[PDB]
Amino acid sequence: ETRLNVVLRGIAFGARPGAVIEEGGKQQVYLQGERLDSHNAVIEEINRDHVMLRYQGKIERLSLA
Amino acid sequence: ATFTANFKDTDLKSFIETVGANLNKTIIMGPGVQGKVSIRTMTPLNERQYYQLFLNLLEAQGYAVVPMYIDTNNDGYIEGDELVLKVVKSAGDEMVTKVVPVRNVSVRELAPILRQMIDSAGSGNVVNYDPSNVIMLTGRASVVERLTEVIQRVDHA
Ligand SMILES: [Ca+2]
Ligand SMILES: [Cl-]
């Protein structure tokens, strides 16, 4: 699991997926390969019920709240 | 090709922006789009059904979607993949959405029953009849479960 203080609020999965991730009470939409805005973290995979992050050269899971 | 989705307490504007990305479509937002969206796909949806979900969830919030055909290359052809959308002000409680196939009957035959149930269930609950003979249900899970059982009973009866 991710140790980053960010909350996964929504996940829409398909051929063109997207996640809504919150940080500091602000919600923001991310596509795969995009960087997290708050931390230097890359949404490497958007899967059905979770996101996999690349943070400081490690893959970490961010699950739904 | 299908869409699954799970949204809990998501800003309307961020929901809207996600559907746009999923569908590969520019969505233009009127002023003062605000609110909260929650939904979970109990079954996958195809592009039409997902767009219908969209329409359904915005409507619940008091927001209408208006499609616009814009010719960005002055060629005299506006291809389906280039439609723009404008948004504007017009446990058993979980918001869920489900697709129910109907194997033995025309789906429109079931309308006057489901009409009665939805009137009774109250707002937020919506039935959509797909031309491929499947019924799509959006609403509170308890209600979606009671519609699913009535659909299926009539089907196999
Ligand atoms: Ca054109
Ligand atoms: Cl035009």
Numbering used by the authors:
A (entry chain C): 122 to 186
B (entry chain D): 3 to 70, 699 to 713, 74 to 80, 99 to 165
What does the literature reporting this entry say, word for word?
Many Gram-negative bacteria use a multi-protein type II secretion system (T2SS) to secrete a wide variety of exoproteins from the periplasm into the extra-cellular milieu. The T2SSs are composed of 12 to 15 different proteins that form three distinct subassemblies: (i) the inner membrane platform consisting of multiple copies each of GspC, GspF, GspL and GspM with an associated cytoplasmic secretion ATPase; (ii) the pseudopilus, a filamentous arrangement of multiple copies of five different pseudopilins; and (iii) a large, pore-forming outer membrane complex, mainly consisting of the secretin GspD. Here, we studied the interaction between the outer membrane pore of the type II secretion system, the secretin GspD, and the inner membrane protein GspC.
The LBT to GspDN0-N1 facilitated crystal growth and the resultant crystals of the binary GspCHR–GspDN0-N1 complex diffracted to better than 2.7 Å resolution, with the LBT engaged in multiple crystal contacts. The structure of this binary GspCHR–GspDN0-N1 complex was solved by molecular replacement and refined with good crystallographic and stereochemical statistics. In its folded structure as seen in the complex with GspDN0-N1, the distribution of charges on the surface of GspCHR is quite uneven with the main hydrophobic surface interacting with GspDN0. The interface between GspCHR and GspDN0 buries 1280 Å2 of accessible surface area with a calculated ΔG of interaction of −5.4 kcal×mol−1 as assessed by the PISA server. The first three β strands of GspCHR and the first β strand plus the subsequent helix α1 of GspDN0 are the major contributors to the interface. The majority of the hydrogen bonds are formed by an antiparallel arrangement of strand β1 of GspCHR and strand β1 of GspDN0. The interface and relative orientation of the N0 and N1 subdomains, however, is essentially the same in the two structures despite the binding of either Nb7 or the presence of the LBT insertion into the N0 domain: the superposition of the two N0 domains results in an r.m.s. deviation of 0.49 Å for 72 Cα pairs.
